[PDB]
């Protein structure tokens, strides 16, 4: 409740990335060390695709912009429709 | 013989499901009074504000414990006595008619269960008759300290 | 044996003549065996071939000790409550000079017991509860009298768990020899759930109840006894009901706060313990780790992995055994337990963790030397028991061909080096001092080694110490001063009679003690290392492991063939360590008083118990009895008719017991035989001897009664020498 | 798996126990008949009238002489004849052992059938109360501590204290 309720939604945010992230990071283990970077089995680029943590650091940022103006610097707008 | 308490892999919870029945109807007085509570002066004071609107008018006297020890006796007697082979009830030192048993070695509504005939009505496994009364027991457990106080139900 | 086996006697054997090794105690009489058997009451060659129980016995013996500490220290905590000193001292600390303990007045006794106190006659104490103690806030004598019985509760029970093993029908192999969890648990939730739990009862209750004690009151003018829950108004001071945070995390605002913590660095003024407030945070920040950490895991797995070219194949299956050696998994431990105790001995004196220590001089150096002899008495052990491994424990060979089998491969080698190391030291590590004498007695200072004379010139200053305080260039944030106050940069200001704590700057004459330590630490280890390594077979004997780690000595041949073995390497290695520690002690107090331990005076002109006499005068190794032994010790040999007196009055005995050891250390054996008969003769004439063939000491027993006495002699000598030059001025 | 007591002085331990408990007998009835004090009331003068007292201790020596002889002479013979030396029946001396103590000397002996016995007939009377008396006494002697301690007044001695609410005694009753 409060910003603290926004926080209830938010425990969900830390709890979440971390766990949703968790399986990928374990899911083919017995890798031990290492990767695509090193020995045998290139394909180049970097890539585009596949998840665990590429996508949630992004989420702390999401939460940020919307949240963002509302508290801020009383918060845009800018309208434009205003809204028309 | 110097003493015996046979235990096999689960001794415990044979009781346990037992400590549980007793324990369970003690969830009990919860099921169906509720605070000693503490260290007894009030005489002025509850935890820290307790009370207000010290517990209770409060009769009670701790003599229990003197009671806890004393009834302890019954508990451990029913259990040996039936080791058994029975003299036990002496009946009338002399003479003649002693119809009366009253029935049973009890368990349940007829010392022999009895009055067998019944219902047209009221018409339309026994660890469950246990399982749910811890699900009545451990429940007041937290309900003693059942508070958030500074704030309260976030939910709400 | 057979009084009567198996199945069919409950009936216990007391009697018919009793037991060991198969031509068992003879029947026919002897003395030695009464000495055998206290010794080597457990060795575990004997009782059974098959480990079977013993792990099932050593869990029980362990229980006994835990109880016992408990019996102990209920005692202590008693004593501490109801012979109080404590209530009185705490309003009063920095006046008081504290006792738990009193005699009764019978015969002489009572010279001893001399006014300590908040007005009672005492024996002054130097282990501090009264300082472990400050922490309890609530106070009063009858409780500690609850904490006390709470002690005797844990005991009887944490002592009927020892009935509840061996003696009770009891456990089997898998349970230890499947390890797979054990540190998992231990470090996670006890290592963790203590330090954790300790946090919860280290700000809850203690912090507040000395947050407003560090002012005065008559306690309970401050603290109610339970007072401290659902309640709390009081937390409010010492901080918020978190006011609106949620379970830490962030969408949190402070315009002015950050949760209790707030790190301390430096010492409290007017209780210079160090802040009672980094004390929660640090223990909290521990446990987590342990809380996370004891969550490995099940094993060879990690150990079987990495190999190198020098590096060892052995590393792998570096021990199926390890799970069942024991004697090895104790030897490893002692090195650590032991070497992890005397690391206490520093962080203590250069960073007190209890309120009123330093000002309290004598009640934390006793400490720093008690904790110091264990981080040594447990290390030589940590070798003995490896020797006990290296010889025996496994039935058979199948350890094979590793890392060890490796180390041994070289062995007239690892110890070939280490040797020269020591004579390089010794010559650079003691005759160094002897220069001074031979040339300051010749007398030409131009050329001594004095901190002034041979040139470094007047700075110690920059190595680490100066980078260490100076600390926040850093990724470091924190706290006005140091981790340890002593380090060079910073501060005049610590404490109220007295100095507690100050730079200590060294130079040379900290330089070369610091080096004698090297050479002393090193030749200690040479003898143990070469001792445990050459455990089983040697270039002098091959047939060498065959009875013993003990055997006396193989036999007059090969030239000498005497000392060898490794009981004896762990006999001549104690002999050193008694110095190792005995001279490290000699180091600290001569420093800590020659500089540091103090007084403050108007305008803070520091007055060290000795105006730094150290300066030019430890460098001379006579100055070490000019300035030490003959200077201080004048308080030991003046101590008669007093109160402490039991020190001066010990200092003669035990300064006797030592000079009795040599008799046991320096002598033959068929000698006291040859004598013991002249005796035995005179005995028979009157008809008064033969039965239980009186016999001389068991070659190595004689060595057992060397050493042991040489230590409880030569040691308590200073335990006296000390408590007698901090009690009274200093 | 259990201690073995059985202990062997022992059978003696039980007869020691009779002494303690039958003696324990004197106490209860007499003090308590107590005169149900009393109709009223009790005066000593009489001997001790003014003779500088009567007993003090001297009373204790006479008490003991009279006794010494008895307690002493005594077990000395509840029984025990044969009375020497080398090897074991075990009682613990056992000397009486085979020989009763006498073949042919006297009538050491009491009664019919080459025996000590009064004979078969009776546990009866006196195993149940006399041993029940082993019990009785102990609780009723345990009752004596209960009856004085707490000394109403005179003496606290050394206080960590922390009573009163109220005194302790015997007259009898209990309150509550
Ligand atoms: C001062 C205290 C007060 C308190 C706090 C207690 C507390 C307790 N008493 Mg208790 N007691 C008190 C006053 C108190 N008593 C008084 C004044 C008396 C005199 C009558 C007793 C006589 C008494 C007896 C004989 C026993 C207890 C027992 C107990 C324990 C039983 C636990 C339980 O829940 O059983 C009840 C809960 C159940 C789930 C059992 C259900 C059985 C019911 C249906 C039978 C009784 C109800 C019945 C139908 C009513 C008919 C009227 C009849 C009483 C005339 C409990 C700790 C018992 C004990 O613990 O012994 C080892 C038992 O010994 N008490
Ligand atoms: C955590 C480890 C601890 C444990 C559990 C053990 C266990 C064991 N050690 Mg051991 N040991 C240890 C630490 C430990 N040690 C340390 C630190 C050292 C270095 C000193 C040693 C040096 C050592 C040696 C040399 C030997 C053992 C042996 C043994 C085994 C024989 C035990 C015995 O009979 O008691 C022995 C205890 C006594 C006989 C009691 C006498 C104690 C005397 C010396 C008194 C001490 C002085 C003290 C001030 C006197 C009391 C005050 C008085 C003045 C009133 C046993 C398996 C022995 C063995 O043969 O292995 C199978 C071998 O003897 N240990
Ligand atoms: C041995 C004694 C010492 C003493 C004298 C006490 C005394 C007391 N404790 Mg207690 N307590 C102690 C140690 C002690 N505790 C310890 C060591 C713990 C934890 C180790 C506790 C944990 C504890 C709790 C949780 C409670 C008490 C409570 C009480 C009070 C009930 C008194 C009452 O009003 O009845 C008339 C009483 C003052 C109760 C209380 O304070 O609330 C009323 C409360 O339930 N104590
Ligand atoms: C060593 C002991 C152990 C053993 C083997 C016995 C054995 C016996 N006890 Mg016993 N008892 C014990 C411990 C033991 N007790 C303890 C610890 C106590 C507590 C003090 C008692 C208190 C006690 C009493 C009060 C009685 C017995 C009685 C008895 C006898 C029959 C029970 C009886 O008459 O009442 C059952 C009542 C009846 C009317 C039964 C009549 C015939 C049938 C029913 C007997 C079956 C029997 C020989 C009884 C007896 O006669 O002893 C003198 C008597 O009742 N006991
Ligand atoms: C840690 C150790 C241990 C040691 C070395 C001592 C030593 C001592 N205790 Mg002690 N004590 C202990 C545990 C110990 N206690 C424990 C666990 C308890 C709780 C049961 C006590 C309860 C206790 C009492 C009540 C007394 C002592 C007293 C003493 C002193 C009297 C000497 C004696 O006992 O024989 C003779 C002596 C200094 C006596 C004392 O302090 O008066 C001078 C007092 O009699 N102790
Ligand atoms: C493991 C630890 C130890 C233990 C047994 C406790 C136990 C308790 N704490 Mg607590 N606490 C601790 C460490 C501990 N704390 C530490 C280290 C801090 C600071 C870092 C706190 C800061 C704190 C606050 C601010 C409060 C508590 C409260 C409480 C009580 C109820 C809420 C709760 O924490 O758990 C039970 C869980 C729920 C009720 C959900 C309970 C007695 C509260 C209280 O007074 O009672 C409600 C509240 O005041 N604690
Ligand atoms: C015997 C084996 C084999 C060989 C030939 C080497 C050789 C070397 N190792 Mg090495 N190593 C090995 C097995 C081996 N290692 C194994 C099995 C491990 C794991 C246990 C390591 C872990 C290791 C580490 C961490 C380091 C080395 C380093 C080095 C180099 C020392 C730096 C130097 O001389 O340049 C310096 C010359 C100048 C002119 C400047 C040297 C080339 C060091 C390195 O990386 O080079 C500095 C580094 O310290 N090794
Ligand atoms: C299940 C459960 C639980 C559990 C509880 C418990 C049971 C706990 C605990 C806690 C704990 C379990 C704690 C612990 C702690 C520990 C510690 C804290 C340690 C210690 C120790 C000491 C103090 C020692 C010291 C020393 C040293 C240093 C060495 C030697 C010497 C001496 C001994 C002095 C909980 C809660 C969740 C709740 C729910 C249910
Ligand atoms: C005539 C006679 C006699 C003799 C006596 C004498 C002459 C003595 C002595 C003695 C001496 C002349 C010396 C001794 C000493 C002892 C001791 C000494 C003991 C002990 C100890 C202790 C207890 C310790 C502790 C400690 C610790 C803890 C560790 C380290 C430190 C110390 C050491 C502190 C008698 C009577 C006996 C008998 C009869 C006859
Ligand atoms: C022992 C050999 C001297 C070599 C080191 C000397 C270099 C540093 C100068 C003196 C070191 C002692 O440090 C000391 O300085 C002052 C003594 O003059 C004292 O000065 C203190 O007393 C006064 C009271 O307000 C004020 O002058 C200061 O504000 C205060 O810090 C302090 O108690 C201590 O901070
Ligand atoms: C059941 C009733 C209880 C018993 C008491 C009633 C009297 C019956 C006799 C028992 C009385 C005990 O005392 C008595 O026992 C004997 C009974 O065998 C008596 O009579 C007998 O004595 C010897 C056995 O003892 C016999 O070998 C003799 O032929 C006969 O004289 C004894 O002269 C007397 O010592
Ligand atoms: C002096 C000395 C002896 C002689 C020491 C002896 C004989 C000490 C043993 C004496 C015992 C402890 C006396 C025991 C007698 C009493 C315990 C019996 C009476 C019981 C009492 C109530 C007094 C050796 O045997 C020895 C062996 C090896 C190397 C060096 C030496 C050595 O230096």
Short mmCIF file of N, CA and C in Angstrom, two decimals, chain C residues 136-232:
data_model
loop_
_atom_site.label_atom_id
_atom_site.label_comp_id
_atom_site.label_asym_id
_atom_site.label_seq_id
_atom_site.Cartn_x
_atom_site.Cartn_y
_atom_site.Cartn_z
N UNK C 136 24.85 -7.24 28.26
CA UNK C 136 23.55 -7.49 28.84
C UNK C 136 23.22 -6.12 29.21
N UNK C 137 22.02 -5.72 28.87
CA UNK C 137 21.45 -4.56 29.47
C UNK C 137 20.23 -5.16 30.06
N UNK C 138 20.00 -4.91 31.33
CA UNK C 138 18.77 -5.31 31.94
C UNK C 138 19.30 -5.29 33.31
N UNK C 139 20.31 -6.14 33.46
CA UNK C 139 21.13 -6.18 34.64
C UNK C 139 20.54 -6.95 35.80
N UNK C 140 21.38 -7.03 36.82
CA UNK C 140 21.10 -7.46 38.19
C UNK C 140 21.54 -8.88 38.43
N UNK C 141 21.92 -9.12 39.67
CA UNK C 141 22.71 -10.28 40.09
C UNK C 141 22.05 -11.68 40.01
N UNK C 142 20.78 -11.76 40.40
CA UNK C 142 19.99 -12.98 40.36
C UNK C 142 19.76 -13.55 38.96
N UNK C 143 19.67 -12.67 37.96
CA UNK C 143 19.59 -13.20 36.62
C UNK C 143 20.96 -13.76 36.45
N UNK C 144 21.89 -12.99 35.95
CA UNK C 144 23.09 -13.79 35.63
C UNK C 144 22.98 -15.16 36.29
N UNK C 145 22.22 -15.21 37.38
CA UNK C 145 21.87 -16.40 38.17
C UNK C 145 20.74 -17.18 37.46
N UNK C 146 20.38 -16.76 36.25
CA UNK C 146 19.41 -17.47 35.41
C UNK C 146 20.16 -17.90 34.19
N UNK C 147 20.84 -16.95 33.55
CA UNK C 147 21.82 -17.27 32.52
C UNK C 147 22.71 -18.42 33.06
N UNK C 148 22.92 -18.42 34.38
CA UNK C 148 23.73 -19.43 35.06
C UNK C 148 23.11 -20.83 35.01
N UNK C 149 21.85 -20.95 35.45
CA UNK C 149 21.15 -22.25 35.50
C UNK C 149 20.72 -22.65 34.09
N UNK C 150 20.38 -21.66 33.27
CA UNK C 150 20.25 -21.85 31.84
C UNK C 150 21.49 -22.58 31.33
N UNK C 151 22.63 -22.30 31.97
CA UNK C 151 23.86 -23.03 31.69
C UNK C 151 23.77 -24.47 32.19
N UNK C 152 23.36 -24.66 33.45
CA UNK C 152 23.29 -26.03 33.97
C UNK C 152 22.17 -26.82 33.30
N UNK C 153 21.21 -26.12 32.69
CA UNK C 153 20.21 -26.83 31.87
C UNK C 153 20.96 -27.44 30.70
N UNK C 154 21.57 -26.61 29.84
CA UNK C 154 22.42 -27.11 28.75
C UNK C 154 23.62 -27.79 29.43
N UNK C 155 23.50 -29.10 29.65
CA UNK C 155 24.36 -29.84 30.57
C UNK C 155 23.40 -30.61 31.43
N UNK C 156 23.67 -31.90 31.56
CA UNK C 156 22.65 -32.81 32.07
C UNK C 156 21.91 -33.28 30.84
N UNK C 157 21.41 -32.32 30.04
CA UNK C 157 20.85 -32.62 28.72
C UNK C 157 21.92 -32.64 27.61
N UNK C 158 22.64 -31.54 27.38
CA UNK C 158 23.83 -31.64 26.51
C UNK C 158 24.93 -32.42 27.25
N UNK C 159 24.51 -33.52 27.89
CA UNK C 159 25.38 -34.49 28.59
C UNK C 159 24.60 -35.80 28.77
N UNK C 160 23.29 -35.76 28.51
CA UNK C 160 22.50 -36.98 28.36
C UNK C 160 22.26 -37.30 26.88
N UNK C 161 22.86 -36.50 26.01
CA UNK C 161 22.95 -36.85 24.59
C UNK C 161 24.16 -37.78 24.36
N UNK C 162 25.04 -37.81 25.36
CA UNK C 162 26.20 -38.69 25.40
C UNK C 162 25.85 -40.03 26.01
N UNK C 163 24.84 -40.06 26.89
CA UNK C 163 24.20 -41.32 27.17
C UNK C 163 23.54 -41.65 25.83
N UNK C 164 22.76 -40.69 25.33
CA UNK C 164 21.98 -40.91 24.11
C UNK C 164 22.85 -41.13 22.87
N UNK C 165 24.11 -41.50 23.09
CA UNK C 165 24.87 -42.20 22.08
C UNK C 165 25.55 -43.42 22.67
N UNK C 166 26.86 -43.52 22.46
CA UNK C 166 27.58 -44.80 22.58
C UNK C 166 26.88 -45.83 23.44
N UNK C 167 26.66 -45.46 24.71
CA UNK C 167 26.11 -46.33 25.72
C UNK C 167 24.74 -46.84 25.28
N UNK C 168 23.87 -45.94 24.82
CA UNK C 168 22.66 -46.33 24.10
C UNK C 168 22.97 -46.92 22.74
N UNK C 169 22.15 -47.88 22.32
CA UNK C 169 22.52 -48.95 21.39
C UNK C 169 23.17 -48.49 20.10
N UNK C 170 22.68 -47.40 19.57
CA UNK C 170 23.54 -46.41 19.01
C UNK C 170 23.92 -46.77 17.61
N UNK C 171 24.53 -45.77 16.96
CA UNK C 171 24.76 -45.53 15.53
C UNK C 171 25.86 -46.30 14.74
N UNK C 172 25.84 -46.10 13.41
CA UNK C 172 26.63 -46.84 12.39
C UNK C 172 27.20 -45.98 11.24
N UNK C 173 27.93 -46.64 10.34
CA UNK C 173 29.01 -46.11 9.52
C UNK C 173 28.48 -44.98 8.71
N UNK C 174 27.36 -45.18 8.06
CA UNK C 174 27.06 -44.35 6.90
C UNK C 174 27.16 -42.99 7.46
N UNK C 175 26.65 -42.82 8.67
CA UNK C 175 26.22 -41.51 9.11
C UNK C 175 27.30 -40.45 9.10
N UNK C 176 28.53 -40.78 9.53
CA UNK C 176 29.73 -40.00 9.21
C UNK C 176 30.36 -40.19 7.80
N UNK C 177 30.49 -41.46 7.40
CA UNK C 177 31.11 -41.89 6.12
C UNK C 177 30.19 -41.89 4.87
N UNK C 178 28.98 -41.39 5.08
CA UNK C 178 28.42 -40.39 4.19
C UNK C 178 28.49 -39.04 4.92
N UNK C 179 29.44 -38.20 4.51
CA UNK C 179 29.55 -36.82 4.98
C UNK C 179 28.42 -35.93 4.55
N UNK C 180 27.85 -36.22 3.38
CA UNK C 180 27.87 -35.33 2.19
C UNK C 180 27.47 -33.87 2.45
N UNK C 181 26.57 -33.67 3.42
CA UNK C 181 26.07 -32.37 3.91
C UNK C 181 26.92 -31.51 4.88
N UNK C 182 27.77 -32.14 5.70
CA UNK C 182 27.95 -31.71 7.11
C UNK C 182 28.26 -30.25 7.33
N UNK C 183 29.18 -29.69 6.56
CA UNK C 183 29.44 -28.24 6.61
C UNK C 183 28.18 -27.49 6.18
N UNK C 184 27.50 -28.05 5.17
CA UNK C 184 26.13 -27.69 4.85
C UNK C 184 25.27 -28.04 6.05
N UNK C 185 24.64 -27.02 6.62
CA UNK C 185 24.13 -27.05 7.97
C UNK C 185 25.03 -26.16 8.84
N UNK C 186 26.11 -26.77 9.37
CA UNK C 186 27.03 -26.13 10.31
C UNK C 186 27.23 -24.65 9.97
N UNK C 187 27.95 -24.35 8.88
CA UNK C 187 28.25 -22.95 8.51
C UNK C 187 26.99 -22.16 8.14
N UNK C 188 25.98 -22.86 7.61
CA UNK C 188 24.80 -22.19 7.10
C UNK C 188 23.99 -21.60 8.22
N UNK C 189 23.61 -22.45 9.18
CA UNK C 189 22.62 -22.05 10.19
C UNK C 189 22.97 -22.26 11.66
N UNK C 190 24.00 -21.55 12.11
CA UNK C 190 24.51 -21.67 13.47
C UNK C 190 25.76 -20.82 13.48
N UNK C 191 26.71 -21.19 12.64
CA UNK C 191 27.69 -20.24 12.20
C UNK C 191 26.81 -19.06 11.76
N UNK C 192 25.84 -19.32 10.86
CA UNK C 192 24.87 -18.33 10.44
C UNK C 192 23.85 -18.00 11.51
N UNK C 193 22.97 -18.96 11.84
CA UNK C 193 21.89 -18.75 12.82
C UNK C 193 22.35 -18.42 14.25
N UNK C 194 23.65 -18.12 14.35
CA UNK C 194 24.30 -17.55 15.52
C UNK C 194 25.26 -16.58 14.86
N UNK C 195 25.30 -15.35 15.36
CA UNK C 195 25.76 -14.19 14.58
C UNK C 195 24.50 -13.58 13.95
N UNK C 196 23.69 -14.41 13.26
CA UNK C 196 22.33 -13.99 12.88
C UNK C 196 21.57 -13.81 14.18
N UNK C 197 21.22 -14.94 14.81
CA UNK C 197 20.51 -14.89 16.08
C UNK C 197 21.16 -13.87 17.01
N UNK C 198 22.49 -13.84 17.03
CA UNK C 198 23.21 -12.87 17.86
C UNK C 198 22.91 -11.42 17.47
N UNK C 199 22.78 -11.17 16.16
CA UNK C 199 22.29 -9.86 15.73
C UNK C 199 20.98 -9.59 16.50
N UNK C 200 19.99 -10.48 16.33
CA UNK C 200 18.71 -10.41 17.04
C UNK C 200 18.83 -10.64 18.55
N UNK C 201 19.30 -9.60 19.25
CA UNK C 201 19.64 -9.61 20.68
C UNK C 201 20.97 -8.87 20.79
N UNK C 202 21.31 -8.17 19.70
CA UNK C 202 22.48 -7.28 19.64
C UNK C 202 22.13 -5.86 19.13
N UNK C 203 20.83 -5.55 19.02
CA UNK C 203 20.33 -4.18 18.77
C UNK C 203 18.94 -4.07 19.39
N UNK C 204 18.11 -5.07 19.11
CA UNK C 204 17.08 -5.44 20.04
C UNK C 204 17.84 -5.59 21.35
N UNK C 205 17.58 -4.71 22.33
CA UNK C 205 18.04 -4.90 23.75
C UNK C 205 19.42 -4.33 24.21
N UNK C 206 20.51 -4.71 23.53
CA UNK C 206 21.88 -4.39 24.00
C UNK C 206 22.33 -2.99 23.61
N UNK C 207 22.31 -2.71 22.30
CA UNK C 207 22.55 -1.36 21.79
C UNK C 207 21.78 -0.29 22.57
N UNK C 208 20.44 -0.45 22.73
CA UNK C 208 19.76 0.65 23.39
C UNK C 208 20.19 0.74 24.85
N UNK C 209 20.37 -0.42 25.48
CA UNK C 209 20.64 -0.51 26.93
C UNK C 209 22.14 -0.30 27.32
N UNK C 210 22.80 0.49 26.47
CA UNK C 210 24.15 0.98 26.65
C UNK C 210 24.30 2.14 25.69
N UNK C 211 23.20 2.48 25.00
CA UNK C 211 23.17 3.66 24.14
C UNK C 211 22.93 4.79 25.10
N UNK C 212 22.04 4.55 26.06
CA UNK C 212 21.87 5.52 27.15
C UNK C 212 22.36 5.01 28.51
N UNK C 213 23.42 4.22 28.46
CA UNK C 213 24.18 3.91 29.68
C UNK C 213 25.45 4.75 29.60
N UNK C 214 25.97 4.93 28.38
CA UNK C 214 27.21 5.66 28.18
C UNK C 214 27.06 7.14 28.56
N UNK C 215 26.47 7.32 29.76
CA UNK C 215 26.14 8.60 30.42
C UNK C 215 26.17 8.47 31.96
N UNK C 216 25.64 7.34 32.43
CA UNK C 216 25.58 6.98 33.85
C UNK C 216 24.09 6.67 34.07
N UNK C 217 23.69 6.61 35.34
CA UNK C 217 22.34 6.36 35.82
C UNK C 217 22.70 5.43 36.99
N UNK C 218 21.75 4.67 37.53
CA UNK C 218 21.98 3.56 38.48
C UNK C 218 21.07 2.70 37.72
N UNK C 219 21.56 1.61 37.14
CA UNK C 219 20.79 0.89 36.13
C UNK C 219 19.39 0.58 36.63
N UNK C 220 18.40 0.71 35.76
CA UNK C 220 17.00 0.36 36.07
C UNK C 220 16.48 1.54 36.85
N UNK C 221 17.33 2.53 37.00
CA UNK C 221 16.86 3.78 36.58
C UNK C 221 16.69 3.68 35.07
N UNK C 222 17.54 2.95 34.33
CA UNK C 222 17.18 2.57 32.93
C UNK C 222 16.33 1.39 32.40
N UNK C 223 16.65 0.14 32.71
CA UNK C 223 16.09 -0.89 31.84
C UNK C 223 15.12 -1.79 32.54
N UNK C 224 13.89 -1.85 32.08
CA UNK C 224 12.99 -2.85 32.58
C UNK C 224 13.51 -4.14 32.00
N UNK C 225 13.27 -5.25 32.69
CA UNK C 225 13.54 -6.60 32.19
C UNK C 225 12.77 -7.20 31.00
N UNK C 226 11.48 -6.95 30.74
CA UNK C 226 11.07 -7.37 29.39
C UNK C 226 10.42 -6.54 28.31
N UNK C 227 9.74 -5.45 28.61
CA UNK C 227 10.19 -4.14 28.12
C UNK C 227 10.44 -3.99 26.64
N UNK C 228 10.98 -5.04 26.03
CA UNK C 228 11.59 -4.92 24.72
C UNK C 228 10.95 -5.82 23.62
N UNK C 229 9.67 -5.54 23.30
CA UNK C 229 8.99 -6.09 22.09
C UNK C 229 7.98 -5.19 21.31
N UNK C 230 6.73 -5.69 21.15
CA UNK C 230 5.69 -5.23 20.21
C UNK C 230 5.82 -3.73 20.30
N UNK C 231 6.60 -3.34 21.28
CA UNK C 231 6.33 -2.13 21.95
C UNK C 231 6.63 -0.93 21.10
N UNK C 232 7.68 -0.99 20.30
CA UNK C 232 8.76 -0.22 20.80
C UNK C 232 8.81 1.25 20.42
#
